[model samples]
Target: GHMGPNAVELTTDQAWCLADVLGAGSYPWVLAITPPYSDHSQRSAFLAAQSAELTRMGVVNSAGAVDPRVAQWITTVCRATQWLDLRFVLLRGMVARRSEETVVALRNAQLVTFTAMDIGHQHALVPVLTAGLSGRKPARFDDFALPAAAGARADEQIRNGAPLAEVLEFLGVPPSARPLVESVFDGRRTYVEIVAGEHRDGHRVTTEVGVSIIDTPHGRILVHPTKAFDGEWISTFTPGSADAIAMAVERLTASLPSGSWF
Candidate 1:
């Protein structure tokens, strides 16, 4: 019952390429992150671009400078999590500050799990994230419109990223109903993942759910970690109401052209 991950240690480049396949599907969340896969030649430009983007996102406002308070905090966290193997590269600082350095801790952790399994690349690397549906159209990047899926609202704007207030305006939620909707609409869900570490037993191949906005061509679709929630998953935070977005994601995974999952 303790099956590990079903993925391999793909070079950062491989992960980036897969992310494009996902972004083309209008799931831009992973594309939004500074890729660890940009390590080959011509990397200076890639790293520079990511650095600028990180600056824009306020992840590295100091341009490689570290604040003492943050340093001390990470020191404590790194030491505390040493028992869990989080005290390594993240201990070197800039773990979450610079776009270039922010992901080492996580990617390293993911890779550790991968090497621990010695898996293959054919398996799906089921990454996890938590997202609130912003009931607005996903911005078109490179003219890649979201492919229509079954059970999706014809008039609905695809939600991937946006502020809820703005999405509410886009959906034209009435003023009287706005307060009530806002109060209950915290579509926050957290999920965990062992990147590239797959199970020979196929335990997590299809049943686990994640909040990943998109999936890789290797047949990786995002799902909720589980459907076991106290209340109805269909809630105000989702577009078209409830976990309609999440349900659509499930349908999307089932219909993806690729043939693998995790």
Candidate 2:
């Protein structure tokens, strides 16, 4: 199973300094809310810029903020010393207002996946999400792109000190986001995640829900909370593309690098 998308809990003696950290349990699925694998300079600049913007927007407190979980976790990422596998999904509100440029951006990703397993003996698939480093050719569009609206909301949250869940609720998230959280722990083959997007004129927002059947060592598990009419996953939502996501995970388990916890 993938780690929940919340801030990862790690002990100082257990942190891995030279390994790629996963966001969620490794999978052939991934969506970029924040660009991953940024160079050191870029990461520094971004953190500094975000810190200032959060301060300036006057939304610096966690009270009245959106998605307290995401809010708290983002800060957790900045302060933490460990890295882990990550994945992403979206919801209806974000899908309602997706943009063409954003779509194109997603199309331009070189999403990839590979097989992997966790320390707990749970076989898993993982997305090898990589962002462009300085001057590197950007990967071909394959998976999803970050939504501008979410970005705006994040800025607002930082400025106003709003909690992350607070913002998600404002976007129509139900009182029990915990249901979504619990889906991950169900020991079922189904999967759950939220994806976000925006439209032109910057007035609309959208989200798309997705589910996949995970074939694990235990058995064939149906991977979704709600049943879909089509009964198939929409392409290019994460891992950028099916090929990339699938391949990345395959490689992970096929060739476990030395020093991996697993």
Candidate 3:
């Protein structure tokens, strides 16, 4: 995802691979991809570029909310990771201001659409960005997902333990929706399945990113990528599983939702 000359777009897979390569290389100095303000001491390539860009634009403030002055510059990590021939996914607002030819090129970049008011109050975006940039190894992370209590309710019904098929039926999830929603035991942690944002016509569209729930008494869920880019993202964040990919691919994508994602 190397869209803009200054843009940094590494697919989740690429990010992981880069991390593996960079991390494995016995360089004298660690390529610290993140700043000290962020909680991670580990490293990531995507986070560094994004955080720097955000800083450069002055688009986001210390609280991570968009500055009205630069709210129109909003960009997302999910969009950023998509390739162009590998062009980077710039801010939807910023992208919109570009020439049609350039805009069309980023069609597969998972770009977003929203007015300033639609996103002006958002503070969660910053946290998600920081999280994706976090260098710490993946652990059982708490992100957007069905409530753990609700997961417990589902578990209670099948205390004796039920197969995934029966579990879905009891849980009321339809087969058509299976790809969009997933609930599974932590033993099997899947990898990141990114459904990049699609480019559409005049009509505005709305949807949720795919979700994967790793069930435990307390389930671990995928985040909105975290809107992701970090290779550290785990498929399974649960007990007995040392390494796993866990959570939602797009916990939230719409400009605004009734539920509180923050």
Candidate 4:
């Protein structure tokens, strides 16, 4: 989840806070805190100055991903929300090339926010960032965010319910090891529990099955992966529950000789 230990632990004010009125789209905004600027009040000013500097140097948010208004908004929102000590989360690839923007954001604001260039590519990063932020509200969001399927493209979300594995393969997981591997959509457990259960065997299953849960709709299906491993354990997928479970069965079905006892 984007929010860490406090994943679902929302205070009334934080819980009711709704964004996305900015623009409704399928991509989650990318935010990165920069190097230590130390002073909260001066951060927004730093980002504003940096944004102007970049615009003067010939990089536009329309052609690239950095928006001056958006940059201003990031600073403005941080001030309005009272997180002056906040900063941008550092990102790589095209988004990070705007070194000035990254630095200014780190120095002048509590957070810098924007849509990801490769929005649907990797959903797992959401957890790592969320955990890093100490389980606070994400600096920004899209109507459809993490845990939600990656955009409503049927081909993208439905190609395989197991994105982690698919992603590993995309990153070049060998053919022999891919199908032979077990994953989180297996439905034999909860990702949280499966991830946490690596220390002991008795605590690996989840009792909940066949119930509905809500999340932004990006994919036709979604998957949950364990942070740890077992012979072949995977947890539950909320929207893709039924189909994902079926997929897991088919993937591991022929391995009757397998010792993976559920």
Best candidate, TM-score = 1
Instruction: For each of the candidates, give the backbone clash count.
Output: 16, 83, 19, 16
lDDT of each: 0.29, 0.28, 0.31, 0.27
* Candidate achieving the largest lDDT: 3
TM-score of 1: 0.23
Q: Write the per-residue lDDT of candidate 1 for residues 1-262, one digit (tens) a residue.
A: 0122222333233334323322322111222224554455555555555554434433335464322333332233222211111111111111111111112123432221112222122121111122222223322122112212211232233345446687656556677655533332333321122111111232322223223332222111232222325522321123221243335433434432332221
Please give the RMSD to the true structure for each candidate, in Å: 17.6, 20.5, 17.9, 19.4
| TM-score for each of the candidates | 0.23, 0.20, 0.21, 0.21
Q: Can you write out model 3's per-residue Cα lDDT over 21-80, one digit (the tens) per residue?
A: 223221111111222223343434444545544445453344444444222122221232
CA lDDT, candidate 2, residue 102: 9
Model 2 Cα lDDT, one tens digit per residue, 1-262: 1124422222111111101221222111232333533677765555444444333433233232323433333223322221232322231111110111100011112321111112232132222122211112212322332243343455466467766555555555455533332232234322323222222242432223322322222322222222236553322222223344344333232222222222
* Segments in model 4 whose C-alpha atoms lie over 4 Å from true places: 1-32, 39-52, 57-68, 75-181, 185-235, 238-262
Badly placed stretches (over 4 Å) of model 2 are: 1-196, 212-216, 219-262
Q: Give candidate 4's TM-score.
A: 0.21
lDDT of 2 at 260: 22
Please report how far candidate 2 places residue 76 from its true position, in Å: 22
* Model 3: residue 55 alpha-carbon error in angstroms: 19
